[PDB]
């Protein structure tokens, strides 16, 4: 409560889960992150070769499709983009694999 | 810079980091001439900023996937952040972003 979603930051003792809600499968539910990360969050050791993709806030609405909806939940902006991964850096395969590991990592756990 | 790590200003413009804006999948659409001359130097960039996912919540909130594609491999994302409609100020951030959203349509 009190910092809106969006500018929260997820620890130990403000987790993943606990900031933005338990992973799983619907629209606009979150579905990154396996038993590690979700524990740790920003705490998480190989968080920076995770935010290394995410965006500034000056990107984040210069890159994205932005939009408003209004329902009746309250008033949402929402956002859809694409991030190219550079494939000339040596650490390509391995960010492929990080990011992998918890795209969906919820499933294999409950 | 990697783009998503750019930072627009009046010296490096919205259409100089982020290409100009347009109706096409990994184009931009948000911001009117002001904010696209700007960047962040824009009077009321803290005001849409304050919308802005934190690194964390950024992978928190959306939904992540990944596609590879004939020109490479992008990292996708979707979300949906709620306003507060409690705040004070929500109807003019409504306002706001209601100039910016789609703005280019109208451009000369
Ligand atoms: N559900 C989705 N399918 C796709 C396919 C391609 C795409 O463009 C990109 F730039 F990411 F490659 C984005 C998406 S989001």
Do not use: C
């Given at each position: 409560?009190?910092?809106?979603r969006?500018?929260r930051?997820?620890?130990?003792?403000?987790?993943?889960?606990?900031?933005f809600?338990?992973?799983?499968?619907?629209?606009?539910?979150?579905?990154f992150?396996?038993?590690?990360?979700?524990?740790?969050?920003?705490?998480?050791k190989?968080?920076?070769?995770?935010a290394?993709?995410?965006?500034?806030?000056?990107?984040?609405f210069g890159?994205?499709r932005?939009?408003?909806?209004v329902?009746?939940?309250?008033?949402?902006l929402?956002?859809?983009g694409?991030?190219?991964?550079?494939?000339?850096?040596?650490?390509?395969?391995?960010?492929?694999?990080?990011?992998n590991k918890?795209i969906?990592?919820?499933?294999?756990?409950?």
């Amino acid at each position: 409560s009190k910092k809106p979603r969006q500018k929260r930051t997820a620890t130990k003792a403000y987790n993943v889960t606990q900031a933005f809600g338990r992973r799983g499968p619907e629209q606009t539910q979150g579905n990154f992150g396996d038993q590690e990360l979700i524990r740790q969050g920003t705490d998480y050791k190989h968080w920076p070769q995770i935010a290394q993709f995410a965006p500034s806030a000056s990107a984040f609405f210069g890159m994205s499709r932005i939009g408003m909806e209004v329902t009746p939940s309250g008033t949402w902006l929402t956002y859809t983009g694409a991030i190219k991964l550079d494939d000339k850096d040596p650490n390509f395969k391995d960010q492929v694999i990080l990011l992998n590991k918890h795209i969906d990592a919820y499933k294999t756990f409950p």
